[PDB]
């Protein structure tokens, strides 16, 4: 399977709780930089570690964040039923997702759909009063790549 990079995240020793995911929730953080930076930023605002389970970089590199076995902090009301996938950038201002990042996102979500037997994938905005993952995020195109069987519909 694809390379999922494993790095030490301050706070990951405090992972606890439970999660039975039946959905994948797509996010942006309005942030460019390393997963370590994002982890440290979220630890400054009441998270023990990064709220997201995976981070997909502009160059298509994928990092493991919060363990999926642990209680999540990616979406209010969905901490025990979801996988949070974050895409590097600010897609409320950035008009163009690099194709390397888009393809890595589809690869990761297909792999997770396979491992967890998950149907439902959508933007944060589907589940909560937010613009996340941003007005310019190619969300319908990405969901199109994930539902190939729809071409025979
Ligand atoms: N510190 C908790 C979140 C608590 C909260 O958001 O109120 C966590 O990182 O899982
Ligand atoms: N006291 C914890 C709460 C975070 C969640 O859980 C911290 O900020 O490290
Ligand atoms: Na880690
Ligand atoms: Zn979000």
Kindly report the CATH number that applies to the domain delimited by 22-146: 3.40.80.10
The SS3 call for residue 149 is: helix
Q: Which of 10, 40, 43, 47 to mutate to test the pocket of ligand 1 (most atoms within 8 A of CB)?
A: 47
Distance CA 135, CA 138 (A): 9
Question: Scanning the structure block, which residue is given the tokens 């979801």?
Answer: 82
The SS3 call for residue 4 is: strand
Atom of ligand 1 nearest to the CA of 17: 10
Instruction: Indicate which residue's Cα is closest to atom 4 of ligand 1.
Output: 47
Which ligand is the nearest neighbour of the Cα of 71?
1
Transcribe 45-112 into DSSP letters.
TT-SS-S-SEEE-TTS-EEE-S-TTSPP-SSTT-SSSEEEEEESB-TTT-----HHHHHHHHHHHHHH
137 lines ligand 2 (CB under 6 A): no
Dihedrals phi, psi of 54, to nearest 5 degrees: -140, 150
Q: Are 105 and 87 in contact (CB under 8 A)?
A: yes
Order of strands across the sheet that contains 62-64: 4-5, 62-64, 54-56, 82-87, 23-27, 120-123
Domains of the chain, residue spans = 22-146
């Amino acid at each position: 399977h694809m390379d999922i990079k494993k790095v030490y995240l301050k706070g990951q020793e405090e992972a606890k709780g439970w999660n039975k995911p039946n959905k994948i929730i797509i996010h942006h953080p309005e942030y460019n930089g390393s997963i370590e930076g994002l982890n440290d930023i979220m630890r400054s605002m009441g998270f023990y570690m990064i709220g997201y389970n995976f981070y997909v970089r502009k160059d298509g590199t994928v990092y493991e964040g919060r363990p999926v076995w642990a209680t999540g902090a990616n979406c209010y009301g969905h901490n025990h039923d979801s996988i949070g996938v974050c895409f590097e950038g600010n897609y409320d201002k950035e008009t163009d997702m690099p194709q390397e990042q888009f393809n890595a996102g589809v690869e990761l979500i297909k792999y997770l759909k396979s491992k967890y037997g998950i149907n439902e994938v959508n933007g944060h905005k589907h589940y909560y009063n937010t613009a996340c993952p941003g007005q310019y995020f190619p969300l319908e195109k990405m969901l199109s790549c994930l539902d190939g069987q729809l071409q025979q519909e």
